[PDB]
Symmetry: C3
Subunit: 486 residues, 3 copies
Amino acid sequence: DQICIGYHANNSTEQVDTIMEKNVTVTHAQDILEKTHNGKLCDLNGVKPLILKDCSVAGWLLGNPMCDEFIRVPEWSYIVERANPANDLCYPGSLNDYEELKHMLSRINHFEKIQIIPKSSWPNHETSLGVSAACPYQGAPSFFRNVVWLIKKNDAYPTIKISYNNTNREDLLILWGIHHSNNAEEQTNLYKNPITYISVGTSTLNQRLAPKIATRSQVNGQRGRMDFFWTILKPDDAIHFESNGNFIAPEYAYKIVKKGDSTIMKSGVEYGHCNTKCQTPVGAINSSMPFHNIHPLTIGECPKYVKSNKLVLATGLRNSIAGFIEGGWQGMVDGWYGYHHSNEQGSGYAADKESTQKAIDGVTNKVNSIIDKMNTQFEAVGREFNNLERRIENLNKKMEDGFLDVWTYNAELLVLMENERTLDFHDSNVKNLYDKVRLQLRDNAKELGNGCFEFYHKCDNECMESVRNGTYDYPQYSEEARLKRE
Amino acid sequence: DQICIGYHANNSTEQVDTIMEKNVTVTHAQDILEKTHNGKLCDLNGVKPLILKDCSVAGWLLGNPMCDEFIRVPEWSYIVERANPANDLCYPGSLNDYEELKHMLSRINHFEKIQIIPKSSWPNHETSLGVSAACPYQGAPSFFRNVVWLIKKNDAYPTIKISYNNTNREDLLILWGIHHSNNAEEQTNLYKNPITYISVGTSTLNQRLAPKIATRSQVNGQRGRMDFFWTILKPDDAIHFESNGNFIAPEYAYKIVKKGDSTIMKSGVEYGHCNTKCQTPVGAINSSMPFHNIHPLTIGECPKYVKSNKLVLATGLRNSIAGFIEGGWQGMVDGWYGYHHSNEQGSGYAADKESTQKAIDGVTNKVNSIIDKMNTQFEAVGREFNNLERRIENLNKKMEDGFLDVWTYNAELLVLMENERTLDFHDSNVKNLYDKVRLQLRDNAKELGNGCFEFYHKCDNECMESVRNGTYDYPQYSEEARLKRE
Amino acid sequence: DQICIGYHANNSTEQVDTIMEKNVTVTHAQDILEKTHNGKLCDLNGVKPLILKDCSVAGWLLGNPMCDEFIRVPEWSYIVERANPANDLCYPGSLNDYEELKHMLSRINHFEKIQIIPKSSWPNHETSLGVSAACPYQGAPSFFRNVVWLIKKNDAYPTIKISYNNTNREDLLILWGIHHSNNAEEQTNLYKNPITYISVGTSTLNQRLAPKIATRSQVNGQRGRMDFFWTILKPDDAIHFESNGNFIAPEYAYKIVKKGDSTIMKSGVEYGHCNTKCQTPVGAINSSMPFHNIHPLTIGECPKYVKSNKLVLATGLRNSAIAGFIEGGWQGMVDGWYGYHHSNEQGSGYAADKESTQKAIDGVTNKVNSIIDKMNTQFEAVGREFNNLERRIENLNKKMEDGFLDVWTYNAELLVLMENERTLDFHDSNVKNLYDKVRLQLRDNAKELGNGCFEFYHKCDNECMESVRNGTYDYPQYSEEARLKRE
Ligand SMILES: CC(=O)N[C@@H]1[C@@H](O)[C@H](O[C@@H]2O[C@H](CO)[C@H](O)[C@H](O[C@]3(C(=O)O)C[C@H](O)[C@@H](NC(C)=O)[C@H]([C@H](O)[C@H](O)CO)O3)[C@H]2O)[C@@H](CO)O[C@H]1O
Ligand SMILES: CC(=O)N[C@@H]1[C@@H](O)[C@H](O[C@@H]2O[C@H](CO)[C@H](O)[C@H](O[C@]3(C(=O)O)C[C@H](O)[C@@H](NC(C)=O)[C@H]([C@H](O)[C@H](O)CO)O3)[C@H]2O)[C@@H](CO)O[C@H]1O
Ligand SMILES: *[C@@H]1O[C@H](CO)[C@@H](O[C@@H]2O[C@H](CO)[C@@H](O)[C@H](O)[C@H]2NC(C)=O)[C@H](O)[C@H]1NC(C)=O
Ligand SMILES: *[C@@H]1O[C@H](CO)[C@@H](O[C@@H]2O[C@H](CO)[C@@H](O)[C@H](O)[C@H]2NC(C)=O)[C@H](O)[C@H]1NC(C)=O
Ligand SMILES: CC(=O)N[C@@H]1[C@@H](O)[C@H](O[C@@H]2O[C@H](CO)[C@H](O)[C@H](O)[C@H]2O)[C@@H](CO)O[C@H]1O
Ligand SMILES: *[C@@H]1O[C@H](CO)[C@@H](O)[C@H](O)[C@H]1NC(C)=O
Ligand SMILES: *[C@@H]1O[C@H](CO)[C@@H](O)[C@H](O)[C@H]1NC(C)=O
Ligand SMILES: *[C@@H]1O[C@H](CO)[C@@H](O)[C@H](O)[C@H]1NC(C)=O
Ligand SMILES: *[C@@H]1O[C@H](CO)[C@@H](O)[C@H](O)[C@H]1NC(C)=O
Ligand SMILES: *[C@@H]1O[C@H](CO)[C@@H](O)[C@H](O)[C@H]1NC(C)=O
Ligand SMILES: *[C@@H]1O[C@H](CO)[C@@H](O)[C@H](O)[C@H]1NC(C)=O
Ligand SMILES: *[C@@H]1O[C@H](CO)[C@@H](O)[C@H](O)[C@H]1NC(C)=O
Ligand SMILES: *[C@@H]1O[C@H](CO)[C@@H](O)[C@H](O)[C@H]1NC(C)=O
Ligand SMILES: *[C@@H]1O[C@H](CO)[C@@H](O)[C@H](O)[C@H]1NC(C)=O
């Protein structure tokens, strides 16, 4: 007859690290790092994104002859663009303030194209010869579909003076361009006026431009250039145009309502018809964990990016007729702490749910607190700087590197500390049980020093159950123990 | 005859949360979050801020007729401006590099207005006709008070050549502008010359401008525009002007001395005859606490911004014929740990001074270290970007959000873990007292197991005080205890 | 006759601070803050930096006459420049996009100067009179050595048209400028053309410029101005020039290959002929500690910057023949951390326990090594490159630096204090464990004096004492002896 105190053990082989030891085996463990994704593009909060395929924002807006597929998108949440678009600008040139326009057009609540100036509004100018071989369409020269290129008619170029009243209830996006010739002979052949100018004016815009005739290298077989501009028109504002040559008039305008912000996404993966909350260039994330290591660039409410490859929290016990000093019992299955009973009546294991419940609740509460004490908010990450803005890009890189280092260090140190804290908490609990059963039986038995007590007298199964309950009668067997001694 | 060990208890109801349990009840607690403000604008380190009421910086500088009376306030620390100023640029137009001037005019010492070019310096030009209905004054047309609008005289407009030494010992701020006409007839009516230009040159400035004549939408009944410029003149530099029309000449200049930097606050709160160290748009704060949740935008030496609503540290014990493991003692005032005594003379309470003093010192040191290990620096937070710089604004927002998240997470985790440690720090000392008295007692008494010892022999008040002091004589009562043992 | 427990103590006077106490004396301690530097400028990863001495970047590129140090360094890691260079621009003027060019002129893999337009290519223009007193050389007027100032010849200025087709296999850097006159008479005397223009065009460049004639202040005795421009030419592109006056044609071009990125250091320290890994304007840092307080501006893989002056991590014992619960100043034990002091008729000695000491030292070493090693360090170049009209971005960067500094300082100090508190308990727990292990083996054969010793009733000699240290004790052997000794 003897009674011993031990702890649960199993065949688990999971390993964790503490501040002082490394590769400590535990019975149970939990991971708090996310490392998986679905590998597809899916909707953000029920709003389908916009996919431009092989086109670009400028080509889509200006109406490139090879990018007319996209004509119906009521709204979108973010824009997906290929890293190296093929069809961007058939005619060589540039667009002013491209990056700001892209950032503004990132997220649009409502989008619709309307016609503001019919082609019949130019009786004294030719509107059918404005084509070039640099913009082929089905093997024939063509031009942008959203603008019209005006040339002289009957060897005359009368001055142009028109204005537009905005009568719609939303803002309008308008684009126009100017063409640079190559030499004086070409300028005379195209516009008949050696000197030309363009004047554009609104309630807040005041612009005046002149052509720049010079010699330039060939791009796409053309030496000329075209520069385009854009503006936003108020609901009750008006815009006035005036020019006498080298003018590319607008034909279509876009009705735009903006009530949010986002960024532009560079990826090559395909659509997947899902709904998600966080999006990455290589897939989507559906995890509640506070840390991840998938990709730096993310859109939406996402966990924090860290460098570490493993963050495991220890939740179980230290894996390994005896006692708690030697090791953990394998015969016990229910509970974490308990007693192994043994006498002439029988043998077996009995668990102590009172402390096991407290330990389980404490561990679960710690894990839940660590997971849920993190605050997240909507964010958009991307690269939105051109060649001549390297300093700001370097500053942003400093931002990201510093934040990454801070988060990595904090997470690693927190995990390393908490593992050891949990282990010593378990040791304290088992020792508390051991001296709880102590100080009650008194001198009726002796402690072998291995975590067990050998009763001098005979303690029945009811007596042992009462001992487990915490109620024991010492004078009942005091005399039996006394004459048992020696 | 028995001696028992216990701890303090009271009628408190404060609650604190640990890493394992939520709102256990404690006797005493302290808050380390600031949530109060006076709701008024105070001076910053004894320096009056600048309040523009219903004006704007450009309107105040240029001298809008309905806006400014006179300068006052030779020095200031920061500028308070309303969200939507009413009087600003009565004549439609714009000011070049407005944001840079706004930022540079934040904190200024010895700001004084002087006159450089008297109106008598224009004998061949008209100076009393430059008025417009767009800037009325007491029901009559007027103009800006700091500049002069020049008109042709006797149907002529001779060329203007003027230069100015800066003989003063401080930097000088000068402003000028150019006017855009509407048509050729209006240009001829205002100035004889049909083609005009403006040339401005200093040791580091080289500018040449020409008017732009076009059709624009009317604002405030005027279709014209005026653009203004500014520059800083060195203490021994000179500035040269040259124009032949469409020239707005300066009349007054400001002597400026700058050392430091601040920002501009958008608020509507009134002044309160106050002196603070940290200022917010909704009020002023002074405190020593490391964290606050009042307003994201702050100026001065302010605590860190967090999102949490409650941050409470525990500085006491766990609240709830007795013993250690029963609960607290309501009846024993004046102490944290102590002994309850009961002999045949009577019963009462006594406290251990040394352990209580040590615990109080430790808790106070912990709280003071947590509060005082924080480093504070002067900072100015505000929004200083226009509509065409959205990317930098997004970068600043990412800045602020990341810092807020880091601080919130760190503060919450630290508070929880320190509460955990402090809550069970006291149990070690109480256990130490218990086994200390048990060690001195040895086997002269019997342990009831609830935290007391039943004395076999008689222990008078002198003996009881000796036991508390730590001077017990085992051989004195050993024989009596042996006889009583049977 | 008795056995006692204690711990090692010595004569060290190191002091550490915990969360609850201050001025705590410890036996051993280790610092994790770096505060020393060699005070020299040394190479970065075997690549010698570029030292410009008293010449600025613009003067070095344009070929200032007073910067005759035409030493060739094919590859450099970073640029060292004085705070206030003296020889910058002999002729007053400005350089467009100066800051971007300076940023791009950081670490360069390959650099070489070649001639693209010989002076013989101007038969109808004068190329020998383009000198000024503002650029002296050995007491004579001179000009920049990389550009040519063209003047009218035979009272005529024919229009200039030229192109250059890039046959090299690397990118090319080209610079050109335009001169502003003072009045109509000077313009007529210099170029004979009242109205002039400059046209430059490449596959991606389209620029047109016109002179601005006005009255300006006198700088270096000259009232004129000169504005310069730069561009990058692709390996198979060409550049076309066209002007009729006020033109400064290029003569030499730079052939450049760029791979990485760096910044510019402002310092006055001398060269040191080293090979370091982290650089600082006041010296070089050679250390593995995670924190330092030398200088905010650094280049390369460097530790974090904090405002603290001391960061000491406790790794020893509480410094101050009975011990265990009274002062454990056992100066006799000099061979371990925990042990026993024994005494009987044969003699006395200070034995030590190897297992507990090994466990404690392994744990402390693992803690210190983990704290030191769990640092992520990446290459970062920190500088201050912003002009007078970009103060807002500079303020943003300053806020960045201040916030990061505050976060790191607070975290480091709190971690150090808390870890010292944690470490100052493990030793006491080990001592207590050893004490109870010593107990429950003698049971009732000895009297626990409570001062930290046990006094055996029976007679135990050196062999029995060694056995009880070994963990093997024969209780029944001396049970009857303890019984008869008990009164
Ligand atoms: C060896 C020889 O003589 N070869 C010529 C060959 O050079 C010539 O090419 C024409 O060259 C001009 C440049 O001087 C243009 O590039 C012509 O291109 C087109 C185009 O882009 O399709 C023709 C088109 O009709 C034009 N459109 C309008 C609205 O005017 C445009 C336009 O002029 C330019 O783009 C303006 O910059 O140019 C190109 O064909 C050919 C002519 O066919 O003849 C060979 O013999
Ligand atoms: C139905 C009808 O015929 N109504 C006219 C009415 O249009 C006309 O108005 C004047 O209109 C002109 C535009 O053509 C200007 O807007 C006049 O404005 C003033 C002003 O701002 O007060 C007059 C002032 O004297 C001018 N100041 C100077 C220094 O020259 C300025 C100046 O010309 C402009 O601001 C330059 O852009 O304009 C406005 O009064 C009136 C004329 O009284 O007659 C009605 O019959
Ligand atoms: C901690 O105290 C709060 C009381 O402030 C308890 O939270 C309340 O829970 C009830 C129902 O469970 C809700 O109806 C209240 O709205 C809660 N109060 C607040 C302020 O949210 C909470 O239960 C306590 N903690 C635990 C573990 O019981
Ligand atoms: C503005 O006036 C000052 C003072 O008269 C001029 O500085 C003087 O210049 C003359 C000749 O240039 C010197 O002889 C004096 O010694 C200078 N005086 C001082 C106090 O420096 C200055 O030149 C004038 N401005 C300009 C543009 O010439
Ligand atoms: C008072 C006077 O007439 N002085 C002139 C000098 O100005 C002149 O020096 C030349 O001045 C021009 C400016 O007009 C220019 O700066 C030349 O570079 C400079 O050499 C000098 C010529 O030798 O003659 C004096 O009489
Ligand atoms: C800890 O375990 C891992 C996994 O097997 C192993 O790679 C590593 O070397 C171990 N560490 C030590 C110090 O042995
Ligand atoms: C545009 O038309 C509306 C409708 O009459 C009018 O109110 C508005 O003034 C017009 N815009 C301008 C600039 O006159
Ligand atoms: C995400 O995962 C959860 C399980 O963790 C699953 O129930 C859910 O359907 C998944 N998808 C979404 C959109 O939440
Ligand atoms: C708690 O007890 C103190 C001690 O007298 C008393 O002053 C206080 O009012 C009591 N509080 C409550 C809520 O009863
Ligand atoms: C903070 O404000 C209070 C007024 O509510 C004032 O009594 C206190 O003295 C202030 N703090 C300091 C340091 O002056
Ligand atoms: C401390 O002890 C060491 C070890 O012998 C000795 O070398 C050193 O000189 C001592 N220091 C002092 C100040 O006595
Ligand atoms: C701790 O030591 C320093 C250094 O000698 C001393 O200045 C400081 O006052 C000490 N702390 C206390 C509380 O005395
Ligand atoms: C430069 O030379 C190559 C060599 O054939 C030629 O193909 C290329 O067209 C030339 N560049 C230009 C702009 O013509
Ligand atoms: C860096 O410090 C270590 C440690 O003393 C030394 O061995 C090494 O030589 C140092 N490196 C250089 C380049 O001096």
